[PDB]
Amino acid sequence: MLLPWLILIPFIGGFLCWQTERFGVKVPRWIALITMGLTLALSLQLWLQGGYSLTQSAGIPQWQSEFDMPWIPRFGISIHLAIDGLSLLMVVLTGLLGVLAVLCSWKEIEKYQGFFHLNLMWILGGVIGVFLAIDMFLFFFFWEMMLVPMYFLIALWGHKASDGKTRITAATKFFIYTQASGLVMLIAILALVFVHYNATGVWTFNYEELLNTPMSSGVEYLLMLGFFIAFAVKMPVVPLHGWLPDAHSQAPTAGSVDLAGILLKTAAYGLLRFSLPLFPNASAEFAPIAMWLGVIGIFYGAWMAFAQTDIKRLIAYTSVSHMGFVLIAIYTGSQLAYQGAVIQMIAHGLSAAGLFILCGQLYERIHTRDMRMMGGLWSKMKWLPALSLFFAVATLGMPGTGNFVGEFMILFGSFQVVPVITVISTFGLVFASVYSLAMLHRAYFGKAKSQIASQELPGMSLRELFMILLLVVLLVLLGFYPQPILDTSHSAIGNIQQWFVNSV
Amino acid sequence: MNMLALTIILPLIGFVLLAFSRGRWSENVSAIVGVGSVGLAALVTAFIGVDFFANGEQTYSQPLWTWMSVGDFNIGFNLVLDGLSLTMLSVVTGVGFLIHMYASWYMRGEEGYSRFFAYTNLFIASMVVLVLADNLLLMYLGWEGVGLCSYLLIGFYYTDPKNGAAAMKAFVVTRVGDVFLAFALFILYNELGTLNFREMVELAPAHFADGNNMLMWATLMLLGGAVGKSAQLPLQTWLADAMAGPTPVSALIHAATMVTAGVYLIARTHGLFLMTPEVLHLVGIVGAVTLLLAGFAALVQTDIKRVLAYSTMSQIGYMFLALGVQAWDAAIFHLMTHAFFKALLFLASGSVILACHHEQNIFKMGGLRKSIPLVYLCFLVGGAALSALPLVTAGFFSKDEILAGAMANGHINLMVAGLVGAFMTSLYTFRMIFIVFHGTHSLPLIVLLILSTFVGALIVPPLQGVLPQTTSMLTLEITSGVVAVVGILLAAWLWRTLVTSIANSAPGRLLSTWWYNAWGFDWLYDKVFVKPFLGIAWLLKRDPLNSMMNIPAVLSRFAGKGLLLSENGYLRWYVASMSIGAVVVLALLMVL
Ligand SMILES: CCCCCCCCCCCCCCCCCC(=O)OC[C@H](COP(=O)(O)OCCN)OC(=O)CCCCCCCCCCCCCCCCC
Ligand SMILES: CCCCCCCCCCCCCCCCCC(=O)OC[C@H](COP(=O)(O)OCCN)OC(=O)CCCCCCCCCCCCCCCCC
Ligand SMILES: CCCCCCCCCCCCCCCCCC(=O)OC[C@H](COP(=O)(O)OCCN)OC(=O)CCCCCCCCCCCCCCCCC
Ligand SMILES: CCCCCCCCCCCCCCCCCC(=O)OC[C@H](COP(=O)(O)OCCN)OC(=O)CCCCCCCCCCCCCCCCC
Ligand SMILES: CCCCCCCCCCCCCCCCCC(=O)OC[C@H](COP(=O)(O)OCCN)OC(=O)CCCCCCCCCCCCCCCCC
């Protein structure tokens, strides 16, 4: 009995963060750090007591933890939480990212900072909730309720140098994309529930009972397509990626909203836990389309990243390319590629968190994000260009970082399944090296292209530097020793893979 | 022994300490840390070799952990040592230590001293990992690290945009080669189920009994990776265009680590290459072709660094030819001797650059045989080892062993390619030294001056039991010495009216300009890869997919603006619209 508290602790922490605004302005950051550390420590405790390295795949459903309480008993809707290895890896990841987001939004001495913390913990608790829910209506509810806090802290707390109309436009674009796709998912969920009620007589929203739903191929294809469109908006999958670079660029300039909301992909988890087990035949027929969309995402995100003059838009397009790799991995049906996708999700979260935090620090140092306005920043800053070099090397796919482990394990499994897509994706890795070196040469190398790049910039604060170094250490540990992560996710990955391949 | 992990860890410790130093230490302290870490690696390598020869040269394995274990996918973090690994490790550590000593002398009063030594220490660490890995994925780790360190070292003077452009070009070309190598790794795991070198060699004949297409694909992609790192065809432009970095960087890349990685990859995977004889002969053809183009391009260059770069290209082509004609011992021996004399030549070139000012042209300067006798003598003996002066230099013996391998295997085209390559090598080498030098006793200079003579030929690589033994010799020695001597005499005779008469002729000027442009491979690669990349990037700088997905918002705005015209505020129109809707409802109900 810790998953209900795993979702409740961020909510109560954000509520009391808003409540303690009367006691000061420097107060709610400490409460925010306390509640995020509490959530992270509880997730680490459930990891340490879980014993995921010694459990075998015994057939879906198989959870480490489970909880059920009737919420809307008229519809058979209940708060139904559960956890296994992959879900626990995701919740530990968002706990760590939320701690980093709180530590990144430090020294934001301003009025209504408590509401900013309240929105941040609503987003983080919502991400934890969609990672933990196994009731379909409850999962969709958690899926759609990050939207109001994210919209409000993009439109009201966003990039202050830009016009307020631009932030409002980006927030409305993000809201419309994600909420329309969520409504499509709700239609698919309702149709699945009604189909199970007609074919059996039992009315429920439980995921474990909706798995054995006899239906025609076209109906299953349509349900899978609704789920896939909902996940493809948030993955992002081209051409539904367009909300992401403007949402990143109009995010608050601290670089905490990116970590809190975007930089963990609940869409890959949603595909793995719902698109493959509920609709395995439809996913099997849909696999070539998703794989070619992933290839297009890889190369289009690479070309988009090379063309930017903004660093933040460049990093957003790198995220698009990496998620194209993950989308190829998910539909292979290969255990090796599934584990590589899990490693790639975690490594992408860490590396993109480091890139966005460094970009935010650079923007606070030089008051611009235009790459034509700088150059030669290696001789002006003490820590930022070398850490940026490390993180560009990491998202380049370099061995010694976890991105290489995830990417190449994806490519090994995919080459066992689909060789041509794997070949094209490895040339996508060449494209990744091209855009990473282009960003490094434009930002930190050469001569100064303006007057702000010709001065000795201020150094790095110790808290920012230490959490960047923590991300560096975690990425290096993932690259050199990914075995605890694989042993954690192996049982859930094997159960999903076996349910996917034994149903086709 | 538990000392191979020491040879990895010590340069890693040096890199980490000097990177986190960030230049706050003194020059002496940073030099002590970097050069001491590389020298400690060399001393541990020497003790490893002593222990290796103390036993019966037995192969030793040192596992550390399991890198990844997903089902049947078991990649281990293990090191292995045999004669080939010992030879490559000794060459890398010793030549890197000498280059580190010369760089500590050479980088005095330069910004980024500790950054330079951190990058070179990570380079040494990456190549030690490359030569000691027992499986292909750990070797790929070392491969990628070596490429990244070469990128960081070529663009060391980052303020000059040409240096960064050269470094970026080298990194992109080598990354293409490593993508070919990744294809080889994927094929070999998908077929054999393992990436361990000994296990792949043991499992290949049993698995590839019916079909042999996938093994040929894997060996072709291994050759693609090898020519990616060793700067051969068709991935060769980076070595020519990336000498903008410092001279010890060039010495390290050309002698110690970077270009010898492909030769090591071919030699280590010889068991897989022997099952695909067509791919091995293709290695030989690639080496011979790169030999010819490098030799022809080296004569028409007007810079010392570019001439030395194409010399490195030609000698790596010799090693690739030796691997193609199954002269593995000759290939590794030529690797060691070429490391010695090319490191010596780059050290002497750096000394003559420091003696001159601003790195001037070679044509306007001359008569340096009196001002600087020591650099002239070092350059002369390095060229003699490069141009194979008989019975006085180790390069003559190494090229003689390569040509004997070409003799014994019955290959004619590769034989004549090697012979005219030796001739062309003699002409361009003695051309360059007689153009520059006609008309302080540093310890590394003396060390690789001694090692460029027959004293370096006395060293025998312990490849017995690791690489297969190579299968008229007097006549071959006589004709090789004759070819080298007539090349020396011809280059002494010309280089100055006949050379101007030949060069100023329109076919002669056309050929000189064609061979100065790396046989047009830079232009060809630009027009087929770099210009269309920039064209597609410019075509896709405004996100067309985002605009096409934003089209429904435009449609919604247009439809709303059109619908708002009916709310004109006229009561009579409201009554008219009510009656129109009544007509529509009544007609629809009567139709159905
Ligand atoms: C624009 C944004 C919103 C998206 C579009 C709106 C939703 C569109 C849904 C279209 C559905 C088309 C159905 C066509 C046949 C209808 C009549 C029929 O014969 O139905 C068959 C079946 C009922 O027969 P029965 O045997 O009782 O069912 C047991 C099923 N084995 O029927 C059933 O069992 C129910 C079938 C339900 C099918 C899934 C509905 C949702 C699918 C996801 C959303 C639509 C597709 C993705 C989005 C498109 C682009 C925006
Ligand atoms: C102002 C802007 C808004 C207005 C303008 C824009 C358009 C809005 C409307 C868009 C949606 C249109 C309707 C889409 C659903 C169509 C449903 C349909 O025709 O179903 C027929 C059939 C039903 O299944 P059936 O075979 O009858 O099953 C019983 C026996 N098997 O179905 C099948 O058998 C399966 C059919 C699958 C293909 C049809 C759905 C295509 C969806 C395209 C979008 C998604 C593409 C994939 C993802 C791309 C990347 C995200
Ligand atoms: C065919 C068989 C043999 C195959 C192997 C051999 C052929 C391939 C060799 C490719 C070599 C390409 C070398 C390009 C180096 C470019 C370095 C550079 O500095 O480029 C300039 C630019 C730098 O970016 P920036 O920092 O913004 O600088 C300011 C802009 N001037 O950067 C750029 O403009 C970016 C340039 C991107 C180049 C991408 C190269 C991709 C290579 C793919 C090879 C695929 C082979 C198979 C092809 C299909 C066959 C069916
Ligand atoms: C190619 C590299 C060669 C190796 C040297 C450097 C490696 C990278 C160093 C940074 C990352 C370290 C992460 C991995 C540490 C070891 C993980 C591990 O599994 O240790 C346990 C192992 C004993 O247990 P094991 O053999 O795994 O048993 C099987 C389990 N049933 O424990 C052992 O066997 C002991 C292993 C000791 C390793 C010491 C490494 C010291 C490194 C110092 C410099 C660090 C530089 C960091 C940055 C590198 C570049 C990114
Ligand atoms: C296994 C053997 C090798 C095999 C191949 C391995 C390849 C993968 C290696 C991955 C690591 C990244 C490689 C490239 C990093 C480059 C960093 C760099 O440029 O460091 C130099 C720089 C100091 O240079 P300087 O210019 O003097 O200072 C700038 C301020 N004026 O330094 C600084 O400014 C400070 C340091 C910046 C970050 C240094 C690198 C961090 C990542 C590696 C160490 C991680 C932590 C060690 C422990 C790991 C866990 C055990």
Residues B323 and B333: their CA atoms lie apart, in Å, by 12
Residue at token pair 């183009």? B293
- Whether the CB of A242 is below 8 Å from some CB of chain B: the reply is yes
Cβ neighbors of B501 (< 8 A, separation 6 or more) are: none
Q: Alpha-carbon distance B506 to B244, whole Å?
A: 31
- Which of the listed CATH numbers 1.10.150.80, 3.40.50.300, 1.10.3720.10, 1.20.5.2700 matches domain B527-591? 1.20.5.2700
Element (H, E) at A185: helix A164-200
CA distance A81 to A135: 7
Interior CA angle at A491 toward A485 and A493, to 5°?
80
Q: Which residues of A touch B529 (CB under 8 A)?
A: none
- Please report how many Cα atoms fall inside a 13 Å half-sphere around the Cα of residue A97, on the Cβ side: 35
Give dist(CA A432, CA A404) in Å, integer. 12
Kindly tell me the sign of the dihedral angle through the C-alpha atoms of B7, B11, B16, B17. positive
Cα A336 to Cα A406: distance, rounded to the nearest angstrom: 10
Give the residue among B8, B166, B9, B14 at the shortest CA–CA distance from B100: B14
> How far is Cα B153 from Cα B167, in angstroms, rounded to an integer?
8
- B555 vs A: CB within 8 A: no
State the Cα–Cα distance between residues B153 and A187, nearest whole angstrom: 57
Contact flag A426-B540 (C-beta cutoff 8 Å): no
Q: Measuring from atom 2 of ligand 3, which residue has the nearest CA?
A: B234
Written as one letter, the residue type at B158 is Y
Say if A299 is an interface residue toward chain B (CB within 8 Å): no
Q: Does B551 touch chain A (CB under 8 A)?
A: no
Instruction: Locate the DSSP E strands across A422-497.
Output: none
Note whether A311 and A250 are within 8 A (CB): no
- Cβ–Cβ < 8 Å for A44, A92: yes
Is there a contact between A400 and B141 if contact means CB atoms under 8 Å apart? Answer: yes
Closest by CA to A13, choosing from A174, A109, A128, is A128
Report CA-CA distances (Å) from B75 to A54, A258, A473, B78, B519: 21, 35, 22, 9, 42
Q: Are A132 and A81 in contact (CB under 8 A)?
A: yes
| Of B428, B258, B250, nearest in space to B348 by CA | B250
| C-alpha B170 – ligand 3 centre gap (Å) | 10
Q: d(Cα A426, Cα B170) in Å, to the nearest integer?
A: 18
Query: Which protein residues touch ligand 2 with a CB less than 6 Å away?
Result: A 216-219, 221-222, 225, 229, 232, 237, 240, 293; B 552, 555-556
Give the CB-side neighbour count of residue A299, counting CA atoms within 13 A. Answer: 14
Distances (CA, A) of A25 to A17, B394, B438, B547: 10, 76, 79, 42
Token pair 């808003």 is found at A18
Give Cα B507 to chain centroid, integer Å: 33
Contact (CB<8Å) A446/B22 = no
The answer to whether A430 contacts B175, with C-beta atoms less than 8 Å apart, is yes
Q: Give the nearest partner residue to A416 out of B69, B176, B190, using CB atoms.
A: B190
User: Which helix (H) or strand (E) covers residue A81, if one does?
Assistant: strand A77-83
Residue A421's Cβ-count burial label (10 Å; 0-12, 13-18, 19+) is buried
Least CB-CB distance to A376: which of B69, B159, B187? B159
Pick the closest to residue A247 from A142, A180, A175 (CA basis): A175
Query: CB contact, 8 Å: B504 with chain A?
Result: no
Angstrom distance (rounded) from CA B33 to CA A195:
71
How does DSSP classify residue A43?
H
Could you give the CA distance from residue B417 to residue B423 in angstroms, rounded to a whole number?
A: 10
Q: In the Cβ-directed half-sphere of B265, how many Cα atoms lie within 13 Å?
A: 36
Query: For residue A263, which phi and psi values (nearest 5 degrees)?
Result: -75, 5
Q: What angle do the packed helices A384-395 and A419-444 form, to 10 degrees?
A: 170
- Regarding the beta carbon of A441 and ligand 3, being less than 6 Å apart is answered yes
CB A210 within 8 A of CB A204: yes
Method: cryo-EM
CA end-to-end span of chain B: 93
Return the bridge partners of A77, or none.
A72
Residues 6 or more apart in contact with residue A452 via CB below 8 angstroms: A366, A367, A368, A373, A374
Q: Cβ(B65)–Cβ(B77) under 8 Å?
A: yes
* Integer Cα distance of A393 and A179 in angstroms: 35
Phi-psi region of B367 (alpha: psi -120 to 50; beta: other; left: phi over 0): left
Burial class (CB in 10 A: 0-12, 13-18, 19+), A292: middle
- State the amino acid at position B566 in one-letter form: S
Contact flag A486-B190 (C-beta cutoff 8 Å):
no
Closest CA to A403 of A352, A343, A358, A354: A343
- Which ligand 5 atom minimizes the distance to the CA of A382? 30
**Interface contact A321, partner B, CB < 8 A:** no
How many residues does the structure list for chain B? 592
Rg (CA), chain B: 30
Residue in B381, B143, B339 with CA at minimum distance from that of residue A397: B143
Rounded distance from Cα B64 to ligand 4 centre (Å) = 7
Q: Does A391 touch chain B (CB under 8 A)?
A: no
Nearest CA in chain A to B185: A412
Is any ligand 5 atom within 6 A of the Cβ of residue A501? no
Please give the Cα distance from B366 to A260 (Å, whole number). Answer: 67
3-state secondary structure of B74: strand
Q: Do B168 and A411 touch (CB under 8 A)?
A: no
For chain B, helix, strand, coil in percent to 5 are 75, 5, 20
As a whole number of angstroms, the distance between CA A66 and CA A81 comes to 6
CB spacing of A303 vs B179 below 8 angstroms = no
